Amino acid sequence: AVQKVVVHPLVLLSVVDHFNRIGKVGNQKRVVGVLLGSWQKKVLDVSNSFAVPFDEDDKDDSVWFLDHDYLENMYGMFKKVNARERIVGWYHTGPKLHKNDIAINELMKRYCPNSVLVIIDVKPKDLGLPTEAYISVEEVHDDGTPTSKTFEHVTSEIGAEEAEEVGVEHLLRDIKDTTVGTLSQRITNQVHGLKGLNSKLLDIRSYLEKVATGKLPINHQIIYQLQDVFNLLPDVSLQEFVKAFYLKTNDQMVVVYLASLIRSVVALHNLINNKIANRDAEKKEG
Amino acid sequence: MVLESTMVCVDNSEYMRNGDFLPTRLQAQQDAVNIVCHSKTRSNPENNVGLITLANDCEVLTTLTPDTGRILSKLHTVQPKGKITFCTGIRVAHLALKHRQGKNHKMRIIAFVGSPVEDNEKDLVKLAKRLKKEKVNVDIINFGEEEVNTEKLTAFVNTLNGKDGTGSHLVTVPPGPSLADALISSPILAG
């Protein structure tokens, strides 16, 4: 079915520009619309969409309505201009999901066998690659609950297209690209420890909270399982590198050797040729 | 003619699966939808009528429209199975009424409750006075079986309108064999 989704900045903006539409008139809830997907393969892609007036009451927390006269005839519009573009699901800006979201997908399953919902974010904050994606399946449960319909997270990734980077990538103009090979990889390293070890502390504090409160989630078992896959090397005191010690510097063996060999001859190219051309102009002029 | 948008709420609760309303509440409430939809046709063409499933979770597959053709199609294979939920079904018509393009149509709701609901008298009076602030006049018609000589829904109807406001009126359905056309006789005469 649906494994991963591809969200373009163009269709994501179609949720963002509608945040100006109903944001000025208010009032409650969020921006919600129906998603037009482009499915060429198991990997899902999204090009365009259409935003529909939508509201969700608080009291009355289970009340939701799409406008389906907007959904029907406007489909024949986008279908007439683009035959490949069709509705794969819906979307909204979240930020989180209330329990009522179970009924939005099951209603529109007449349009698509499986409707994928995309939670987006109009204001970028944290922690990383934004928005979100969910898929609607039924896993029931191990405890014996009646059949449980819970949306499972779908990994979301941004993607590009020809001719769409004209105006999009133009307006920024302030970015330095990249530079690959010097700063590009090292800034990630400073962040790879930051973003790597912050979720380490956020989860290890919530995993300690388990014993305290919030149990379940037990989880189970996914938590410790892949944590023990992380445990191929801990790495703890001290590094257990006795076999990887001589191999540590042995990987730095040729990297330092070439860096010593290149800088020697690069100098011979830089130093000699500079002295030659310099004294040819300098002393022959005066 | 009176201007308003009448949102009829079909009852999918598990207690609608018997035949006390002849021949069966599925076809009886169908005939109960037949008489209200054909009456609005005799009343005003501009009145648009949708349908909503109260039990389980509220979902509307038919956009609010004056044509009852799609409504009569959804009356078949409705599968009345689920737990009745009332409180969420009051504003469920009001939210579709807030999506109305024309604002000249009054807000009117008719819901079918055929199952006993667990509710506190304080919960129904808060929704009552909430509709007073929203001016919505909701005509409820008791169906199925419920608390004998229904109190809650009666207090929900009584406290919903006042001075006059002509209005919201509840008609208690007798637990006896009858045709669905004979049930609506009093409510359709005087709402």
First to last CA, chain A: 80
Count of beta carbons in the 10 Å neighbourhood of residue B26: 21
Query: And the tokens for A205?
Result: 């504090």
Inter-chain touch A68–B61, beta carbons under 8 Å: yes
User: Which residue has tokens 């939808």?
Assistant: B33
Q: Is B45 exposed, middle or buried (0-12, 13-18, 19+ CB in 10 A)?
A: exposed
- Residue pair A88/A35 in contact (Cβ under 8 Å)? The answer is yes
First to last CA, chain B: 16
**What's chain B's Rg over C-alpha atoms?**
15
E-strand spans in A4-140?
4-7, 32-39, 44-51, 55-56, 64-65, 86-92, 116-119, 134-138
Q: Which of A29, A62, A102, A105 to mutate to test the interface with B (most CBs of B within 10 A)?
A: A62
Q: What's the full length of chain A, in residues? A: 286
- Residue pair B76/B13 in contact (Cβ under 8 Å)? The answer is no
Q: Please name the member of A55, A68, A69 whose beta carbon is closest to the beta carbon of B95.
A: A55
Residue A204 contacts by C-beta under 8 Å, 6 or more apart in sequence?
Answer: none
A22: Cα separation from own chain's centroid: 26
User: Which residue has tokens 């429209």?
Assistant: B65
Helix (H) or strand (E) holding B22: strand B21-22
**b/e burial code for range B116-144 (CB count within 10 A of at least 16 → b):** bbebeeeebeebbebbeeeebbbbbbbbb
Helix ranges, A176-244 (H) = 183-212, 222-229
DSSP letter string, A240-267: T-TTTHHHHHHHHHHHHHHHHHHHHHHH
Residue B132: CA count within 13 A, CB half-sphere: 16
Count of beta carbons in the 10 Å neighbourhood of residue B10: 23
- Residue pair A52/A14 in contact (Cβ under 8 Å)? The answer is no
Q: Which of B63, B84, B87, B91 to mutate to test the interface with A (most CBs of A within 10 A)?
A: B63
Degrees to nearest 5, angle at CA A234 with A231 and A235: 155
- Residue pair B53/B10 in contact (Cβ under 8 Å)? The answer is yes
Inter-chain touch A59–B91, beta carbons under 8 Å: yes
Tell me the three-class secondary structure of A137-173, residue by residue: EECCCCCCCCCCEEEEECEEEECCCCCCHHHHHHHHC
Residue A53 with chain B: CB contacts under 8 Å = 99
Helix ranges, B44-189 (H) = 69-74, 91-98, 121-134, 152-158, 180-183, 185-189
Resolution of this structure in Å: 5.8
In 3D space, the residue among B170, B186, B175, B188 whose CA is nearest the CA of residue B21 turns out to be B175
Residue B91 with chain A: CB contacts under 8 Å = 57, 59-60, 63
Helix (H) or strand (E) holding B25: helix B25-43
B22: Cα separation from own chain's centroid: 19
- Residue pair A108/A91 in contact (Cβ under 8 Å)? The answer is no
Inter-chain touch B90–A67, beta carbons under 8 Å: no
Q: Tell me how far apart the alpha carbons of residues B32 and A219 are, in angstroms, rounded to a whole number.
A: 50
In what order do the strands lie in the sheet containing A32-39? Answer: A149-153, A134-138, A116-119, A86-92, A32-39, A44-51, A4-7, A155-158
CA distances from B25 to A148, B22, B174 (A): 30, 7, 14
Q: How would you classify the pairing of strands A149-153 and A134-138?
A: antiparallel
